[PDB]
Amino acid sequence: PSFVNPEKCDGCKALERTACEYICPNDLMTLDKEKMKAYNREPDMCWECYSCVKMCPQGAIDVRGYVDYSPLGGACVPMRGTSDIMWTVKYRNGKVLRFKFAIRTTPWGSIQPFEGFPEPTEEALKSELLAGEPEIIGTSEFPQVKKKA
Amino acid sequence: PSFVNPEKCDGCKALERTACEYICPNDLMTLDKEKMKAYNREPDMCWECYSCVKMCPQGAIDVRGYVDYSPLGGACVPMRGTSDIMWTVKYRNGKVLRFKFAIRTTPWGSIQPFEGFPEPTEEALKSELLAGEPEIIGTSEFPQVKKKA
Amino acid sequence: VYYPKKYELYKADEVPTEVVETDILIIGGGFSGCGAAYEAAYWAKLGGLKVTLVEKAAVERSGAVAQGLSAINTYIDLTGRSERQNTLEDYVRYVTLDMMGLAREDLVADYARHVDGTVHLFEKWGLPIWKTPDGKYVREGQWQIMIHGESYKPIIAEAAKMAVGEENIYERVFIFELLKDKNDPNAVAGAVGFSVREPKFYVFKAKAVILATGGATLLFRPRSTGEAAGRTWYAIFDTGSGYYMGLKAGAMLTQFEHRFIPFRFKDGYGPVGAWFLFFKCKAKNAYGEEYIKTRAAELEKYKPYGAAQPIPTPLRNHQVMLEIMDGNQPIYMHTEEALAELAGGDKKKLKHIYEEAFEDFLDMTVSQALLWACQNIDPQEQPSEAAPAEPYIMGSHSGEAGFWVCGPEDLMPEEYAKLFPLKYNRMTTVKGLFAIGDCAGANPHKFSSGSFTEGRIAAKAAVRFILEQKPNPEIDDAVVEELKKKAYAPMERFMQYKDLSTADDVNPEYILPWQGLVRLQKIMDEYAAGIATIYKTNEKMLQRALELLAFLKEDLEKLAARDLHELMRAWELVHRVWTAEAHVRHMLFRKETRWPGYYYRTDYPELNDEEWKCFVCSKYDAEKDEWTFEKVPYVQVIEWSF
Amino acid sequence: VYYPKKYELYKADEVPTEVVETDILIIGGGFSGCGAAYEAAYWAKLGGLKVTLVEKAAVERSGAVAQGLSAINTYIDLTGRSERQNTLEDYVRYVTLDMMGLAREDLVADYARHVDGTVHLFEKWGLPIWKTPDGKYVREGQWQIMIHGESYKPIIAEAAKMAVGEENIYERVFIFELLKDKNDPNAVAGAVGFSVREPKFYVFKAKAVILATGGATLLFRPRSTGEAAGRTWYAIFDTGSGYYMGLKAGAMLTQFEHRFIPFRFKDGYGPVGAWFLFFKCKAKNAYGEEYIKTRAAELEKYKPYGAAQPIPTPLRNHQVMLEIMDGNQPIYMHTEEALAELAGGDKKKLKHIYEEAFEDFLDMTVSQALLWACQNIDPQEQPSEAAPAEPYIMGSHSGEAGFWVCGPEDLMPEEYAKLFPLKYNRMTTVKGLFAIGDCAGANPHKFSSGSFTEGRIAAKAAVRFILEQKPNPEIDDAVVEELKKKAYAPMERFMQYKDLSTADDVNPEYILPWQGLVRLQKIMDEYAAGIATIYKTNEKMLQRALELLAFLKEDLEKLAARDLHELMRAWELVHRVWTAEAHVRHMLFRKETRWPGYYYRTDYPELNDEEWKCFVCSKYDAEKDEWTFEKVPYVQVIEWSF
Ligand SMILES: Cc1cc2c(cc1C)N(S(=O)(=O)O)[C@@H]1C(=O)NC(=O)N=C1N2C[C@H](O)[C@H](O)[C@H](O)COP(=O)(O)OP(=O)(O)OC[C@H]1O[C@@H](n2cnc3c(N)ncnc32)[C@H](O)[C@@H]1O
Ligand SMILES: Cc1cc2c(cc1C)N(S(=O)(=O)O)[C@@H]1C(=O)NC(=O)N=C1N2C[C@H](O)[C@H](O)[C@H](O)COP(=O)(O)OP(=O)(O)OC[C@H]1O[C@@H](n2cnc3c(N)ncnc32)[C@H](O)[C@@H]1O
Ligand SMILES: Nc1ncnc2c1ncn2C1O[C@H](COP(=O)(O)O)[C@@H](O)[C@H]1O
């Protein structure tokens, strides 16, 4: 499960919102108003999805594998950018692996949902065609499927 | 697991020792110096042996069946005396059963460990006889067992 | 287990209600939900309709694709953009045979003819798809393509947000029950929920509601019960909310007995699809035996399913179940031999596929890479153990449990239209209520692309429904008030009975969410064909499961919660309990074993195509508290032959 | 899971040491330990010897008999005080046959000839024994007698306290390691422990040490993993402490592969002995079949064991397992039919046996009565489900795992005396170190009376040993200081690394006791023939278990503790891990399946009397970190025939 490093967490107090609290799909990350530092409120409900880890601007969050089956010592640390993500995998025995994968080919926030699509019409609303079809499918005509005689 | 009723618990008034904390075979019962009331510190390690329940002079301890398999509503309440013990079993459906069983045929603290036994001797130390034997066994002589031919 | 740092308690009467009026309400901002938001925004303009998306977490990473995915499992390729083109008829046949003969082909063919357009949009939006030197999408197996999908959900979330608008997206709001038309017991009128960030009760009034909550996980005890109780293969975030609210409203369920048992890397539950299909990895028992071959004979009895290619998923599971029953584990995925054989002695080639192997996990289930790191397992040197996980209830993957939904006018046969008052694509039997993704049953193998696509289909149909029928349901304020009281009841119960014990979590008058969940998992694990009995069950066990679930349902009325987080956990439990009951009743009804490998009814061990080649549909009547079942014979809709 | 209310931390150097010098040190104040304290006090006077009893909890209720017991399972009756007289030869035969041919008959015959005297003393001390109108002890089965034993432990505790004196009983002191004679590498010199009520380190210097810590539970994942993880059938208070310290000292273990799987009422694990033997209750599968009948033929292959009366317990379990694998659960104890049959229409008779039925539970496992109450199960109306629990390791009950100990000079054959440097009754291969109750292996079926009795036997032998050999062990102060540091290391590690995380229980540099325990349970459950695989295992699984246990053992060096309670929990975990390793290594060594029903080696499925009718004994050498195994052929010591 995820855990927060006290030395690196600043409670996002210099930001408009708390990143980890905002991103967690299972509502596990929250702030200890006392320390003004985050913590995983229910680790046994952590999916180890690493969303909080990737979005913490201070890189204060890491993941310690579930105790049920994880010997101590292993770690996967991501450094997510805008077009790619870097990963460092550290083995219990000290071995270190480094990888880098692409994550997006376009700028963030650049999607134009219906770019190139014609306006919807009442007539079109009655057909089987979805927005952009049939051309977004790659065919000039709507794909046909043979019904059993 | 066991749980303490705050309304009846007096943190063991002025007595010399905390009954529940003293008796628990798994070291679960302890005192909250703040509230001056007891609580089970690790319920998933409770064997539901009812030792604490029986020894609480205020009857401030009860047992709520493990949540893994227990629907709410059932209870077994003991009232342990000196020669017998009474039990009241209440079902989730309202059914109430009452029993009473003997627990001892002699006064408490009346055991004389070697009553009527002869004094031990260096010679007897070398035999197979235990304290009180062969008399306490009830046989006409120390029990013999046939060795395999 | 949950131990809140401090209390966050509220009484229903002190919580403010926020009323939101909209035309189309989409519950769940995951892949299917984002697809619905995206498509609805396009057509809504025709009537100036308002579209609202409500999500319990944050759309950017919510749902099954939180970690990203390493492939898009459904891409037909009708023009040759990938390494392998396919036809729609071949796809429909593939899905029906994998389902052991039972699938709503009108629904499957429908999403399949639309799915490629969705994939193409995904790439246009920035999703990096693996490509060959010639520029073709890299195929994993016959129907999937590899992707660099770490940001798969964020990209789709951006598209949905740009389409519907941020002011129409409500996050950190948990929907727990639907609202029905005060003047029509079979029409939806909205839904109710509560914030998990502040004291606020939500009342959504809508003309059409689309259930996109994902499936249900954690109904069954997992293979790890401590911290790793959270390591479920499927999304732990999906707890059968859609199933619960829809079934309570009277929407009919279908194939709810058809769970999905995934065979994955042991403990971490990493994916095997790429390893089997792309890396050509072999699975062997503890004695180096390739059971897909040594257990081939056992599949001959299934006709024609046992001779299908690929072998139907449940039958693949059946072969490994036989090995487990014989006690031949560990079962290994020989990644070391797969990489060596693929590289062919070329060290540079080895390094490349090695990086691809790790990306397969780092882009989708990091825990598996973390497991390897903690256990010093180097995939190029030693194999990894694999095992089937516990059951999951969902309709988007290899399982088809979900609501009985209407199909398109041009494909749905009259045989399948009988139970729908209104014939709109993906609408349930409850008027105005749609179901998509995991929530739509009888049309599996949708996965990411297919779920987003089904959402698009339902969304357009919802706009068409509103403009054509001009729905105008009225919510019942008396019911809303009763639901508001129930919503926060757990908090009020905690406050009312906490003083009975010196320990908050050991009380005789209430159970906390984690306590009720442990109980549910044990019941299902032991009586409903869970891991405890190697997925076997019978009439007696199922009947006992219903008795125990009855005790638990009654105790749900005595649930307690200490903060908003736990209040959500409380309702997530309620949702799972009813989902579990529906699953048990469906398994009890079907007197055959059609999906050995998923579950076995030891009292009816054979597959019965004479009397059970039908969809099992049920309806729960809340007013009478009665369940009714009926069999709908399968009919082949699309042209194909074995 | 454990969440301390507040910290209770101490550094080794801040903790005061209390040195206690004694002659005989008894570790564990349960039934065997109390028997040792009682008997030792009697003979100790011959040399003015000091006898010390150390217990981690409170002797009044500590151990397996905390709730009391409903019967005394071992009473031969050589005179006719009960409803049925028996012979010693028949008893020895009974035990060896139950062990499927392997039992140290010299040890069994020895406690058997002494046990009746112990029982007679128990009655003299106030234990109420069920009596017939004629004044005879009421028999349960052939070897047991019914008792009103709610206060069974308190009564025995009083006897021990009266015998040795309260000033010689140390309570709330957890012993974690033995001390050896720095004059002699194979001789004991005492032991070390710590208080769980205050910061105090204990150093016990002794001439003889008797291990009476009870067996080991919670090594395997239970059938309930939430709060009910605490509902272990056997004593949750016993965690293999004696096994750990003795094996570390170099004392040889025997039959450690022989675990016990109890078939009991499901979930609550209430007793079945009285129901089967006294109430004549039948156990039937879900279809009403009495499987001891339908599965009788399957025991024919186990001649002559399978044709023995009573049928060996493991074979009874085997019949149950066959039913479970065939999917014929639930298995029911038909208490309703038993009560009706026994009462014969006599309402007053029914009331009487009904009270007896409830006493059987209220005098020993209240949880079962509580379970009935919570689930509305009235035994006179409906049956109860039964099932086998997870494995437990002990030597006093139906399991015979424990230390290889010397027998009496008049019964022990030369074949069994070879490994003992000194021939003293119940002494281990380590000079001055004795083992009793659960800690003494190869002589099971001792139960309460027999365990107390074995303690008496070892105690006299210890006094004889001291007066004859006149030992004068010297403890190594250097080792003692090392152990003191180790004792509180977990607390110091917690203080040193807790700042790495905002959560005390999610840290990368340490594991808490409950976390290490969940891990141990998962490993044993999945690879060491736990419930997960219906008690099946093989060479590969066992080898993988050793690999995982190795990782865990290394991680024990990074254990953390937040208070004294958790520090005890930390060491209880350490004790369990080593006990688990020993168990796995023993199961790996014996290449046969002698006790189907307890465990199955799928790679060696048959019982092998040609090559394995021997005791498997092992020794762990701490210095070299090596395990050595030896086979000691079984020889029939007492005269009897099948
Ligand atoms: C969990 C998981 C899933 C898959 C895979 C690996 C793993 C580890 N890999 S492979 O291994 O198979 O191969 C895949 C792969 O590589 N390629 C692919 O295409 N699909 C894969 N899936 C499948 C897809 O992910 C799946 O088909 C789709 O995501 C299903 O879409 P949907 O049915 O929409 O479910 P969702 O989880 O995305 O979203 C549900 C939303 O509902 C929210 N929610 C839930 N209940 C709520 C409440 N009551 N009120 C408010 N909102 C409330 C959720 O928060 C989420 O946002
Ligand atoms: C748990 C259990 C056990 C039985 C039964 C039901 C149940 C639910 N039932 S039937 O239904 O199955 O049949 C029985 C029955 O009716 N009749 C009968 O005679 N015996 C039955 N047993 C068996 C007996 O109880 C058993 O044979 C004896 O108690 C064994 O005696 P011993 O081996 O001495 O174990 P113990 O548990 O009594 O005592 C051990 C002591 O050691 C302590 N201890 C442990 N580790 C220590 C450490 N490191 N430092 C200091 N002290 C440290 C314990 O705290 C305890 O005080
Ligand atoms: N052995 C196999 N043969 C054919 N298809 C498979 C096999 N294993 C997995 N698939 C699948 O490929 C995809 C990814 O598999 P998985 O990750 O196991 O969910 C799904 O589309 C499955 O149908």
Ligand SMILES: Nc1ncnc2c1ncn2[C@H]1O[C@H](COP(=O)(O)O)[C@@H](O)[C@H]1O
């Ligand atoms: N069917 C049986 N036949 C003979 N002895 C039994 C049977 N069932 C249990 N016992 C036992 O009776 C005692 C109590 O049973 P149990 O509660 O099963 O431990 C032990 O002494 C066992 O040997």
Ligand SMILES: Nc1ncnc2c1ncn2[C@H]1O[C@H](COP(=O)(O)O)[C@@H](O)[C@H]1O
């Ligand atoms: N562990 C067990 N599981 C099922 N039946 C058992 C077990 N131990 C003993 N029995 C048997 O105990 C009784 C012995 O029967 P019998 O030999 O006919 O005297 C029957 O009531 C069986 O149920």
Ligand code: SF4
């Ligand atoms: S996102 Fe990082 S810095 Fe911000 S509160 Fe969370 S852990 Fe602390």
Ligand code: SF4
């Ligand atoms: S790893 Fe995922 S599930 Fe766990 S806390 Fe972080 S965001 Fe939440």
Ligand code: SF4
């Ligand atoms: S023995 Fe009873 S009164 Fe005394 S502290 Fe414990 S619970 Fe409270």
Ligand code: SF4
């Ligand atoms: S019931 Fe027994 S184990 Fe549980 S807290 Fe009380 S005395 Fe301790």
Ligand code: NA
């Ligand atoms: Na495939």
